Amino acid sequence: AKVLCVLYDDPVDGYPKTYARDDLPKIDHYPGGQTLPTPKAIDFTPGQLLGSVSGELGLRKYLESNGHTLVVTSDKDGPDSVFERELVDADVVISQPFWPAYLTPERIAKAKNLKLALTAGIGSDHVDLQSAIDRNVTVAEVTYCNSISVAEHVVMMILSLVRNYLPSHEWARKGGWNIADCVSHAYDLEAMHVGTVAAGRIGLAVLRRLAPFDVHLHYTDRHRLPESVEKELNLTWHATREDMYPVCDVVTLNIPLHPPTEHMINDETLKLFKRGAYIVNTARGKLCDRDAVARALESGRLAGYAGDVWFPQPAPKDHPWRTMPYNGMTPHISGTTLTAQARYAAGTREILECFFEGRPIRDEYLIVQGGALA
Amino acid sequence: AKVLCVLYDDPVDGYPKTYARDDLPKIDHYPGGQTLPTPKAIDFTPGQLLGSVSGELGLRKYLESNGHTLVVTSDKDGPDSVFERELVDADVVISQPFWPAYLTPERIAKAKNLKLALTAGIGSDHVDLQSAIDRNVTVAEVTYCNSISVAEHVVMMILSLVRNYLPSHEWARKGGWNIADCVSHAYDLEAMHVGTVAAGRIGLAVLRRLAPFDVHLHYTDRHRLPESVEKELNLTWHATREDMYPVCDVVTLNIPLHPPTEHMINDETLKLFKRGAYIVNTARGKLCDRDAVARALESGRLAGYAGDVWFPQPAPKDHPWRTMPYNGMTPHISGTTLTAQARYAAGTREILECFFEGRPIRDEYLIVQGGALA
Ligand SMILES: NC(=O)c1ccc[n+]([C@H]2O[C@@H](COP(=O)(O)OP(=O)(O)OC[C@@H]3O[C@H](n4ccc(N)nc4=O)[C@H](O)[C@@H]3O)[C@@H](O)[C@H]2O)c1
Ligand SMILES: NC(=O)c1ccc[n+]([C@H]2O[C@@H](COP(=O)(O)OP(=O)(O)OC[C@@H]3O[C@H](n4ccc(N)nc4=O)[C@H](O)[C@@H]3O)[C@@H](O)[C@H]2O)c1
């Protein structure tokens, strides 16, 4: 078989020879009982850079020693990209949401041998599922591989915005001291009201991590949590999003992007926020109107905004969230820590081994098989 | 009835006219039951900048309407300072540990009217206690006012160091993207081993906030925690610090500085740390050999160091910790958020009202009284 795998670029100084540490913490299962990936073997050491072109998700020896071919590229955009060239006879396509190779209807029509569309990570929005259903292509992803990673990133950003970490560190780095300059915008998080807009895997993991900070927890979602869970975390439920914003000091978005949530944070809905609110968005860039957010921070309607998701992505060089007041942005990285990469490279190999050996792919990995069967 | 009060400078662009939010979260008590300060009244709005020269801890109208004088300065260092000149007849001296007016033996000898040494915050380290005992000066502090603030700062720095937040935010800020450059030094915190060197007010608050991150918790102390707390937080006790270091991925220092702890982190003890360990130090700068820490980051033995405490303070513009690799420094600020300032400005006024009216200062505020430690 031919496996076509799209990854992001190696670092500026090259593929790293050494790493900061030797191994990764041992983990058995995700919250809720789903066990971590179980490939038969792996050909990488956990903690290596796996999501760049030279990392190859640790796949080449396993594939080439089994008669398969592996094409790894970072060129994914347009009809004359390496990706679209190699796609016509590829059996398997793999990409990460951090550099996704879009499987449009027209691309899937051209992919004569395509049988498996694999997401190395979480989030198959780059794959047209109706075309996969019609064409009998399996669509899978490494469920849960980076939900905890993103949750950590969220709480880190909450603390950093509220306490004014990033300008304070800049004073230290640039040779200043300037205590009043640092803390004129610095508060404690304690006893603030903090809401999450969804509360699925990331939203719940964020709520658990916030609880011992003695914040008052709020959430909204289409489907209420078991009030057993509501009782343990002392959650206030809001049936609608617009009800939750006004009572929150901090709001984190952990909701999927689709037409009803597109630009859900806009000039109109930002006026429902308490003056000086904080928003953290590690979900999707287009949940927020780019310029409404920028206006809110210049006017002080928000006192901070942080996230790793942008629109468009990758963010253009002059994108306003890069330099607006009190931003805590990173590039799109939160689910591709070296830790997460080890889990989803292993998950990728587990799915490939099942697929080539004709064994069942884990039901929790599946999105499409014959039909929208998860 | 002369109050000499030393505060830090206003922000470089002047004392603020507006603030990010209108109020502060409501808090009743500290962990363990101690109530927040209870002055008869306050002449500030909580959330205002009170610890700088124009904030005056909100004290002027209360002192002056009672016939006292208030002298506020930021010039405190050495014999030619405003502070030394005003000290000769001050009855009350007030100082924050973020900008401390040192009451050395020689200075206290010159302070002919000195009756009360008040710390606007936590940490009588700047006051020679034997001199205060010998001269019957009362020494008091606003106990617990910023313990939670520092604990939040610790967890914030741990997450930032492990996930490589600060260089990632620089890539975003400067117009780049560079996913592999961001994450070649980024890990999850989950299931790491994290140890605190002591488990007092801050150390226990740090441990409680770390628990839902699913880390493995470790601690040292002269006195063990109660067995019920050990099992509630699933703590591993270590009898010596040196016995704790080799199993920790993260070590946070929450211990006072005195001879047995000075330079306790040095070229020799650093060889006990795991490769790629992180250190956070919001305690005191001189707990660490300054150049040994920098050497350990330059040579790749430590994956990160962060804190808000330095030696000396303020840090000179070329202090090595400002620019050494993988540092997360701020200036000394973690206990002077606008939230914390509101508590210790209220407590400062409470203590002053007690002292001038002859009512007993709270026992938990007292360090020295009546010629003895108390
Ligand atoms: N590297 C990254 O930045 C990164 C990494 C991983 C994932 N993601 C992003 O992609 C999403 C997945 O996040 P998720 O938590 O992993 O997904 P899920 O568990 O299915 O979500 C809970 C659900 O919310 C729902 N819902 C749905 C529609 C609606 N109109 N209202 C609702 O309320 C429904 O009820 C359910 O609770 C976003 O969260 C965001 O994180 C980004
Ligand atoms: N803005 C800031 O950065 C800031 C703010 C407030 C305070 N501070 C700093 O000044 C200290 C107070 O911190 P603390 O936790 O408030 O003080 P405490 O409750 O008395 O300490 C727990 C004790 O540890 C002890 N101990 C002692 C000696 C020894 N050889 N072994 C031990 O084990 C003993 O056992 C007990 O548990 C440092 O911690 C650091 O935080 C910094």
Structure-token pair, residue A14: 């090259």
What does CATH list as the number for A1-145+336-374?
3.40.50.720
Instruction: Tell me the C-alpha distance between B130 and A135, whole Å.
Output: 85
> Is the Cβ pair B168, A333 closer than 8 Å?
yes
Judged by DSSP in three states, A277 sits in: strand
Instruction: Tell me the C-alpha distance between A349 and A219, whole Å.
Output: 36
> Is the Cβ pair A339, B18 closer than 8 Å?
no
DSSP tag of A327: B
Residue in A161, A119, A154, A155 with CA at minimum distance from that of residue A139: A119
B156 in contact with chain A, both atoms CB, cutoff 8 A: yes
DSSP tag of B55: T
Is A25:A59 a contact under the CB 8 Å cutoff? Answer: no
DSSP tag of A313: S
Structure-token pair, residue A19: 């790493």
Tell me the chain B residues in contact with residue A188 when contact means C-beta distances shorter than 8 Å.
25, 148-149, 152, 337, 339-340
Q: Is A141 a pocket residue for ligand 1 (Cβ < 6 Å)? A: no
Same fold, A1-145+336-374 and A146-335: yes
Is A251:A219 a contact under the CB 8 Å cutoff? Answer: no
With CA atoms as reference, the chain A residue closest to B158 would be A156
Instruction: Tell me the C-alpha distance between A153 and A161, whole Å.
Output: 12
Which of the following is catalytic: B153, B284, B319, B349? B284
DSSP letter for each residue of B102-114: -B-HHHHHH-TT-
Residue matched to tokens 């628990």: B211
With CA atoms as reference, the chain B residue closest to A46 would be B187
Is A331:A308 a contact under the CB 8 Å cutoff? Answer: yes
Report domain extents, chain A: 1-145+336-374, 146-335
Torsion on CA atoms B245, B251, B256, B257, rounded to nearest 10: 70
Structure-token pair, residue A161: 């915005």
Q: What share of chain A is helix, strand, coil (3-state, %, to 5)?
A: 35, 15, 50
Q: Which strands make up the sheet holding A302-307, listed edge to edge?
A: A235-238, A216-220, A193-196, A250-253, A277-281, A302-307
Instruction: Tell me the C-alpha distance between A252 and A214, whole Å.
Output: 17
Q: What are phi and psi of A37, to 5 degrees?
A: -60, 145
How, if at all, do strands B366-369 and B138-141 pair? antiparallel
DSSP letter for each residue of A88-153: GG-SEEEE-TTS---B-HHHHHH-TT--EEEESSS--TTB-HHHHHHHT-EEEE-TTTTHHHHHHH
**Contact residues for B73 (Cβ-Cβ < 8 A; gap 6+):** B4, B5, B6, B7, B53, B81, B82, B83, B86
Instruction: Tell me the C-alpha distance between A262 and A123, whole Å.
Output: 16
Start-to-end C-alpha separation, chain A:
25
Atom of ligand 1 nearest to the CA of A261: 30
How, if at all, do strands B366-369 and B372-373 pair? antiparallel
Is B139:B367 a contact under the CB 8 Å cutoff? Answer: yes
Instruction: Tell me the C-alpha distance between A165 and B328, whole Å.
Output: 9
Residue ranges of E strands in B44-165: 69-73, 92-95, 116-119, 138-141
Structure-token pair, residue B265: 């982190």
β partners of residue A281: A253, A307
Is A25:B192 a contact under the CB 8 Å cutoff? Answer: yes
Residue matched to tokens 């990010």: B20
Buried b (16+ CB within 10 A) or exposed e, B105-138: eebbeebeebebbbbbbbbbebbbbebbbebebb
> Chain B window 101-120: which residues touch A at a Cβ cutoff of 8 Å?
none
How, if at all, do strands A138-141 and A366-368 pair? antiparallel
Structure-token pair, residue B262: 């000075």
Q: Cis link prior to B212 (omega < 30° from 0)?
A: no
CATH superfamily placement of domain A146-335: NAD(P)-binding Rossmann-like Domain (3.40.50.720)
> Is the Cβ pair A186, B333 closer than 8 Å?
yes
